[PDB]
């Protein structure tokens, strides 16, 4: 994973996102959704999804939330106050903690001013405390600003490392982007049915065809402009649409 003071930032983009494999994986110790409850994720579409990744203590997962304070949310990683995404977290004691102490996971513990939301700060200047110019030298009136979790496998819970991923769905002003999944049923034939073919809503009997579209045409129309054939998206076969009987 990535440190807590220099988190990563992956910009998920146009694709088919299935937040159900996430939501039901039962391996996550924390799955909170803020802008939007979790089950309705696989039914919405945004412009961009960002995913931020890092590693913290066990009991600092409560500062990854909109409107908190503490050494993590103050100056390591700040979430805006109208967040939209979801926060996921799971314990990772066996991967990140090693006997003798894993001193490779640092965090920032001194900064001049709290972060703006989604702002990032990887500098390593000596936190000049005393009016006396530090001059880049340690000692008194000058602290190094980074400390390290010394993780060890025999730590009580709440001191073992947790890995965190923060998904943030954003909606600029583009034309579209990544969308959830497309729940579909099965296609029946020879029965007056109520059908929807990726947008085409109609009613009628469906029947095997013997016409041949061109391999970019979806549905066919009659003279007087009524839909009378479709192509099944999944199997790509042409089916005629006749009305069911009236008289």
């Amino acid at each position, epitope marked *: 994973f990535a440190s807590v003071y220099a988190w990563n930032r992956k910009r998920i983009s146009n694709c088919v996102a299935d937040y159900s494999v996430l939501y039901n994986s039962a391996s996550f110790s924390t799955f909170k959704c803020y802008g939007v409850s979790p089950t309705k994720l696989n039914d919405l579409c945004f412009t961009n999804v960002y995913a931020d990744s890092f590693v913290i203590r066990g009991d600092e997962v409560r500062q990854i939330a909109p409107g908190q*304070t503490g050494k993590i949310a*103050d100056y390591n990683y700040k979430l805006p106050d109208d967040f939209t995404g979801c926060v996921i977290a799971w314990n990772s004691n066996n991967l990140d903690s090693k006997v003798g102490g894993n001193y490779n996971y640092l965090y920032r513990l*001194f900064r*001049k001013s709290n972060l703006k939301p989604f702002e990032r700060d990887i500098s390593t200047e000596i936190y000049q*405390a005393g009016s006396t110019p530090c001059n880049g030298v340690e000692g008194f009136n000058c602290y190094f600003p980074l400390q390290s979790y*010394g993780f*060890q496998p*025999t*730590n009580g819970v709440g*001191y073992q490392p947790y890995r965190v991923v923060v998904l943030s769905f954003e909606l600029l002003h583009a034309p579209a982007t990544v969308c959830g999944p497309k729940k579909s049923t099965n296609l029946v034939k020879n029965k007056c049915v109520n059908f929807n073919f990726n947008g085409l809503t109609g009613t009628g009997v469906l029947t095997e065809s013997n016409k041949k579209f061109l391999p970019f045409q979806q549905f066919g129309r009659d003279i007087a402009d009524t839909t009378d054939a479709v192509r099944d998206p999944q199997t790509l076969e042409i089916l005629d649409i006749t009305p069911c009987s009236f008289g």
Partner: antibody, heavy 115, light 108 residues
Framework: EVQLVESGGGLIQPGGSLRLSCAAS????????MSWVRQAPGKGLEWVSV???????FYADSVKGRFTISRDNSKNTLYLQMNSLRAEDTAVYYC?????????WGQGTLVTVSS | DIQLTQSPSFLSASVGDRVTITCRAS??????LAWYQQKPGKAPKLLIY???TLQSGVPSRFSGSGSGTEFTLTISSLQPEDFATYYC?????????FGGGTKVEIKR
């Protein structure tokens, strides 16, 4: 180097109040973790409150609410305005500059007798 | 669950000797705490850093021994002038737990 001195202790009754001034004799109270440590006489210590270089509070368990900390950087003073003392805090108060551990923390008293 | 640290208090010794004080930790803590010297009627002074890296401005008589839990301090070659209590703490976490304190007598 740094010689923190504090003032403001005395005697009062319940529902009273009192401002304590951790006078930062010494430098840069604008950018340091500061805290209040309390002990009743004959007892072990106890932790009260803490200010961040950036402003946050996190009060203790029993003194949750009813108790306020602040700083003043231009005056180099920490301010502890309390009120409604359950008189059960009659204690010896310390203010210490947390520097990755603690140390550098003067002394100062208080009593909250109901008489 | 908060940590409750413990100590075998009320020590008694003579000068120039070895004495050893342990500090229990009734939960899995890592290895970051600190020891203090509390002379009577005064302010504390921390000796052992967040483990054993003794903070500066102290003599060569203290030897903090750290671990996952069951931390232990040891004074070797005593000197008549350490009449006070010694506490444990626990840096890192905001609300921290303190020890119980060990007074140490000086056998005459």
């Amino acid at each position: 180097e740094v010689q923190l001195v504090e003032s403001g202790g005395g005697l009062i009754q319940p529902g009273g109040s009192l401002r304590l001034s951790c006078a930062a004799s010494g430098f840069t109270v604008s950018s340091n973790y500061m805290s209040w440590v309390r002990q009743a006489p004959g007892k072990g210590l106890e932790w009260v409150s803490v200010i961040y270089p950036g402003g946050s509070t996190f009060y203790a368990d029993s003194v949750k609410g009813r108790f306020t900390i602040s700083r003043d950087n231009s005056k180099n003073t920490l301010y502890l305005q309390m009120n409604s003392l359950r008189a059960e805090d009659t204690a010896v108060y310390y203010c210490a500059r947390e520097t990755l551990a603690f140390d550098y923390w003067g002394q100062g008293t208080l009593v909250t007798v109901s008489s | 669950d908060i940590q409750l640290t413990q100590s075998p208090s009320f020590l008694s010794a003579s000068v120039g000797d070895r004495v050893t004080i342990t500090c229990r930790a009734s939960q899995g803590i890592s290895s970051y705490l600190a020891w203090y010297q509390q002379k009577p009627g005064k302010a504390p002074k921390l000796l052992i850093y967040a483990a054993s890296t003794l903070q500066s401005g102290v003599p060569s008589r203290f030897s903090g021994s750290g671990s996952g839990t069951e931390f232990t301090l040891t004074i070797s070659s005593l000197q008549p002038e350490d009449f006070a209590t010694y506490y444990c703490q626990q840096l890192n976490s905001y609300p921290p737990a303190f020890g119980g304190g060990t007074k140490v007598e000086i056998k005459r």
